[model samples]
Target: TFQERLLAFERKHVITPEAHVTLAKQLAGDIALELQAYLRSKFPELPFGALVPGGPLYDGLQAGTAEHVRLLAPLELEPGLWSLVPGVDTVAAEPRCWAVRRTQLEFHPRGCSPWDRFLVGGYLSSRVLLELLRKALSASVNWPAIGSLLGCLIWPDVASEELLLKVQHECLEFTLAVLMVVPGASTDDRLLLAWPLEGLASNLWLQDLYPVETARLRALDDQDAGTRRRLLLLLCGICRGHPALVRLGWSHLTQVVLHLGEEEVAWTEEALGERFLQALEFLVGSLEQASLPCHFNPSVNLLGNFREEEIDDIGYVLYSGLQVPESLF
Candidate 1:
């Protein structure tokens, strides 16, 4: 019953712009034969063309013009299969139309399934991979990485902890993906194998704060600036060991602090003057001692916060407090 309706719909939808009857007959005939072969293979006891005509029923289904729709079939198969048939003159040469036609035949009898489960599973798997990759590479602390590592373990059948670990090892892939857009040079590798220079800086930052690990993150928390500055200094020292990270020592770090200062101005309404300068000076000294170039200028705008200009001035003084060796430049 479903096959008959499906074939009728295909014949109705089938479009032959040139109106070549011979070509249409051959195409339709061949499609019917293929359908018969599939059904016979799946159900050997069923006679060829037993359920529908010519298998003109098969012709309509294959001609990609079937619009056959049925609620149920006699076959004791899966619940979500059906035979779809389309009306004549409705079938287009588009690939999607052919896909729709094929799916109707494959899924109609079992149940009118909308999409292939395997395809959906594949898409979800890839999405998980992308999200995990982004979190692993972009995380600022080891805790986030650890969390990502653990979360990927729960889906044992789809993605085991070992698979996740293996995927995590490909952090370079994520780094390269980000670097392609971030300020940097480009490379010709298909897999984007190289670890980004900034990633190296970030990794160093995490390593220096060792023995402290947690899976929690607090983007906004009330904390003393002095403590923050000390933490930043520790990270700077760790970053100095890696050559790629050291390249961004004073200038880059200064810019980062300046940006942080700007944020402080916006949120706290207090100019982070001396503290900013002092932090830079500490970083500069550390960089110099590490034999890295320290070419950052300490001059910063000091016109904000009328009541705290002096306090802000202390920052510049602290920055210049360190005695920098000329050879360190």
Candidate 2:
């Protein structure tokens, strides 16, 4: 079954004697009025960027069960106005709902037109965005019409694999993941993360490229405190060097990870140093949420993926409770 599906996906979506020059030629020729014209034809008052058409359908695939052609084009809105960040509570004044007032204006222009509200500002719902991205393809590959925009993906998310497709249909060749990066101008700016030829090929084979590092990681348990830290360092070093990701300033993110590493309560050589702050915060959050003393064992109960603010809000006051030895800090 594995072989059959592998060959089926391979024959239909991978490798070739010739490139799909048709798609390339079409993309190369014109920053056509078609997309510009298409957006306007639908609603005349908005300014949008050149519709960047990319992804499996566009990238040269054998073409059978295509999921959709993905596109990324930012809209230009009027200045200093607010947009309702979609898919979250408008009733609350939080980053998830109201974009830092007027911040999006720096990244993407403000949207003031009656027909178009800026789609970002936390105003954009990931779910709805995915809905729009799933628009199906309806035209020939050569001069695709907006219906071709049907299977469009604006971008995907990396925070959760929920957005990822384990197995894709024809419209898409690779798995999609989107990750939000801090952008100087826009908070909503993101990456259309993908893995293909076959999904996840890089993570598996790429690691083998550094045999010494591979052995090193294997020697340390996958969950080892040192191993996790080292793997994180290795992953960060690789990502930080990427031309595109480096632009987003991923180095700071790794620094933050290392900062997290520093918070490990490394008491003994074999100690799986618990994330000190997380354990404290969760300790309090549990007490607060349940209105009772939580039975959590901080060393074993702390969470790993929580945001600093999420933890802080739970109660940094709880930090005093940690039995952290001085060296662990």
Candidate 3:
């Protein structure tokens, strides 16, 4: 019956090939809204109503037995789809209880859904180009052209295949792994993207692309330490070249440092070297000219992705703890 209903819905909504494509692009957003509404209507008493943790209703709602009920529900659903209903144990105390007891949810198609697959493919194709450009360009080259190439390659319009390929072939050493996942079809783009850029640094010849003073830094067993530092420096250089990326980079670095330090240690100096400091000075100067406040707002964390490891590294200091000197804020 559910399959029949799904087919009927698809027939009604996906009447044309173009319509199906459009729907596929919007399927996740639409399903998210639908799931939220359905849960809210089905179980008003529970936070997130009948939805899972971190769903639409979780915020600004009291945690109680209703939440307990919602938590215990068999909330797992097919990839990209979900459903929920109050469970027997939670509702037994009060028949027709408004409390949420159980929820069904799924993330099944994983990244294999047609829409997701397309995005993954696009991202891979674009990354190939970025690697090529990074290889061709000199480390000291602070050119917007390079940043433009990066932007074009990583976030190109869906319709632009030429731009995508141009980016892919920009460098000879650029491996296909940098563009497309080796086992592209086997995993979702999200999972592939989640793979640390560090993993690809060696393959892409990052050490050669941007050499650092490895001897000056403490000789640790981790060869990656230098690579990571070089990558950050390169990113900082890119930010200096691209205004948009400057802001993004500053935001990202600030967040990273803030969330990855101890309480007394508001700033992280461990990985950042002379090059990083130089880049930070440039960033601070730019921010100052823009009249942006030189302070961290803990409230921003509320709107951000709170990675647990990052949070621990930042020492739980959301605002004051993350702030650098007022001169460089």
Candidate 4:
């Protein structure tokens, strides 16, 4: 019965058709190619890598708004060219907060240092990237007018540091995000993100969580019991719809699944209901202790940024959902 309800829920909520996904990838790829050309000319010294499509839509796990697409613009610094001196302790401890430096002499050309323009103490600045990329995009395309013809708002004045494109047309409406990444930063695909708790001045080189989750998904598929991903899809869809539980975001729920996966829990379709209950119980226990260790960095609590009332609401919603799992679907 639970599986039946889940199937029905998926039928209704998992709206990413094969055709739409193909179109989204095409659009994302097109923009990525254009941005690459612009970025190379704009900043010749920077080792800008090929852009790749990322996020749930790309990962075959689109459960919520299929409109949103993410592109990763990797900073392809060679192993010896640049170095990661791990000693930043502004928020997280060293290694986690690496100071990325241009070790190669060429990067520090005559009368100018890359850091002088783009960083503070070897740490890649989010503000610098956002500002530079904004200028490049503005120059490359006419903002509202170009976006109108393309059926999207190319570079809207959004608060997010990442380049945002709001796409709306007769066929579809979706938001596209382009993010700068320093892949293999000392490296686990750690993104250069401005910490939400602190201001934009506080940029942290945190792990890109997609690979971590995707690795597990692949392992589960190999094991012939990858039903947990479906469960995650259902949970994500519910989170998107519910106001109280929405705060328990995809990242938070991802850690929950990762924790259970670490425990070697049975993930067969037959055991779905049991594992679902177990996951909720584990989360409840973690909430009670006021700590959920990050899968990649155990020292950092994932819920550290959550407010007290937000925690209360999440806990309340999850606890209530446990009584009627069907309702969650």
Best by TM-score: 4
All candidates: TM-score:
0.18, 0.28, 0.17, 0.83
By summed lDDT, the worst window of 10 consecutive residues in model 1 runs over: 208-217
> Candidate 2 residues 149-253, lDDT tens each?
433222233333212222212323333222111111343223222111122121110000112222333344334435333323322332343343232122222
Residue 259's lDDT within candidate 2 is 34
Q: Give per-residue CA lDDT, model 3, range 21-128, as digits (tens).
A: 233223222323443554456445433213222211121112111111111112121232311222112322211111111112142343533222222221222234
Order the candidate numbers by TM-score, best to worst: 4, 2, 1, 3
Measure candidate 1: CA RMSD: 30.5
Record all residue pairs in model 4 with backbone atoms less than 3 Å apart, i.e. clashing: 184-187
The predictions' CA RMSDs to the true structure, in order, are 30.5, 16.8, 25.1, 3.5
* Prediction 1 global C-alpha lDDT: 0.27
Off by over 4 Å in 4: 61-68, 86-96, 102-116, 138-140, 144-151, 162-171, 185-204
Tell me the tens digit of each residue's lDDT in model 4 across 1-329.
67677667778886566666676666666777766766677678876677776777777645424434667777665566556544344444543344455565565642254434566555565556666665665565445654554566666444554456555443544565666677543434446432222343344454455666666766766676567676676667777778887666677777888777665657787777777777778877887777887677676677777888777777877784467888666
- Give the total clashing residue pairs for model 3: 21
Of candidates 4 and 1, the better by lDDT: 4
User: Which candidate leads in lDDT?
Assistant: 4
Off by over 4 Å in 3: 1-255, 266-329
